[PDB]
């Protein structure tokens, strides 16, 4: 009976903003209390930037009211080279006064021009900040944009349950299904079977699970080692590896790290082929968000983001979800 | 009938910490709700630094309990190069959950070894952060240390009322006078008369003021242009200026800026002579905190701090106070 209490993080300078408000409102369906915080780059000691920030806050309060999202907004002014500590401090200090959000909601980072680099470069920090402060995190990904309360969807919502998460992905999909925007859809729960798993038992146990929770969902089990999917993904990967192509203890440590990199890339591509085969036309896909790298290198962030962009390439809407423990 | 609701800021690594708790407790006398935040330098994405931070928080909760200061504590982990944005963000975001501190309490910054430079270099930022977020600020200065509830003081508390502050300095002194530690003292309100002020009228009007507020305070008016004080300060300044000694529009702009620097230094020294003449043996001195520089240069901070250190040199305990407007 746990439900998300949301904390939205945004960077200010329009589409991703209103999309995020719409998703937040549909998750909450008028209940709860949501905190929306916008980060505005400027001088935190300047009165002119302060009232600029309170104009933004007023505009955000109006918007929340329009999408019928119950809560309040807050603007935070930071200087450019301090966005990192300002964000992580907000997460540690939110609800010093009483409320405590248990769920962070953010947008997938953009990284096409130089303006976006502050939001791209803090992505891993935000993911770590959530789990370290006992919050789930939700990451919305999509250039195909998100419906408002004016629309009625009725296609597929696919929950891929491929990690032990206590059913967190499933809860998010079930919660959307309760809102009128998504109520018409068909919920599907897709398990991915490894070579040693028992597909029939996975199907039966998932069916008994949703039956006992009285959830109207279809159950499907797909094979990660599918011959066709594996051949296709391998051939695709080799072509990708050629584009971006344009003593003993530390030796073998180097080989092992490269091995795992190549292996992780082949896996991402195989997952993408599987998602395209089964959910190319799905209106919503919910996935676990994998553990981010422990290291702060720029290559580590670039690799993490690329892994996930490759994995979810050419899909419509993806929501990544990650809990705490 | 306004009263301060405190927010203490500390940097962690012992004496200044407990001194600050004692002053906070004496201002509040068991009432209100106080937030104590400690800044711990580390990795905000590291679990090991997180539970380190919660040990500190537990130790602080115990200490507040001992000095009978009602409220709670919070530890914030930041990296070293992000202390600036982490502090200013805490001030903007404290009481997102309900409570709203209206008064920041900090310690005068230390700047003797390289460990202190993070706290010294954020001093002006903290002063601006308070006023921009509609908070008064209180700055405790003293190497001669502060009494705990075990002691009874009975010397002089001198409120220098030399700026239009709505009586904020006086309120702070009156509040201490209500606590048993300071109740035995004699409160003195000292006005400083410029050459064109009318000393007799200043005295009469201050006496009628405290009479109508039913405050037991003595009233004294001193002359800033005192011949002896002015001669002494001038001779002292010339000696100081020799130690640290070891087209037309921008020309005159340069001369004017140097003029005001030399003039500000002579004034600081004159004020210090006046405070030593009248309050050398006072147990507590309360002063307005002057507007900090608008510029972020390192020389601007160095000059601001030096001005105030020169002004309050060789005194026992000084509390600077600054409101909002």
TrEMBL record, chains A, B:
Subcellular location: Membrane
Residues covered by the SLC12A transporter C-terminal domain: 20-139, 154-222, 247-325
Top-rank taxon, per record: Eukaryota
Protein's name according to its UniProt entry: Solute carrier family 12 member 6
Covered range of the whole protein: 661 to 1058 of 1066
């Amino acid at each position: 009976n746990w439900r998300p209490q949301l904390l939205l993080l945004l960077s200010m300078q329009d589409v991703r903003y209103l999309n995020l408000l719409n998703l937040a409102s549909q998750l909450k369906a008028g209940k709860g209390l949501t905190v929306v915080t916008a980060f505005l780059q400027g001088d935190p000691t300047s009165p002119d930037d302060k009232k600029k920030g309170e104009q933004v806050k007023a505009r955000m309060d109006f918007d929340m009211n329009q999408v019928r999202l119950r809560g309040f907004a807050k603007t935070l002014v930071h200087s450019e080279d301090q966005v990192r500590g300002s964000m992580s401090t907000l997460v540690q200090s939110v609800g010093l006064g009483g409320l405590k959000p248990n769920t962070m909601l953010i947008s997938w980072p953009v990284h096409e021009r130089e303006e976006d680099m502050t939001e791209y470069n803090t992505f891993i920090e935000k993911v770590h900040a959530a789990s370290i402060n006992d919050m789930a995190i939700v990451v919305a990904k999509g250039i195909i944009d998100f419906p408002s309360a004016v629309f009625r969807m009725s296609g597929m919502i696919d929950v891929y349950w491929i990690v032990h998460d206590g059913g967190l992905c499933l809860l998010m999909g079930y919660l959307l299904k309760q809102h009128k925007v998504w109520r018409g859809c068909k919920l599907r729960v897709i398990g991915i079977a490894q070579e040693s798993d028992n597909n029939v038992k996975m199907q039966e146990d998932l069916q008994k699970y949703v039956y006992q929770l009285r959830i109207d969902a279809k159950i499907m089990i797909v094979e990660l080692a599918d011959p066709e999917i594996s051949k296709n993904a391998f051939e695709r990967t080799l072509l990708m590896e050629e584009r971006t192509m344009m003593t003993k203890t530390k030796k073998e440590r180097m080989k092992a790290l490269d091995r795992s990199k190549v292996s992780k890339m082949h896996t991402a591509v195989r997952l993408n082929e599987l998602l395209l085969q089964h959910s190319a036309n799905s209106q919503l896909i919910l996935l676990n968000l994998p553990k981010p790298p422990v290291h702060k290198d720029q290559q580590a962030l670039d690799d993490y983001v690329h892994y996930l962009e490759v994995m979810t390439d050419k899909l419509n809407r993806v929501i990544f979800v990650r809990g705490t423990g």
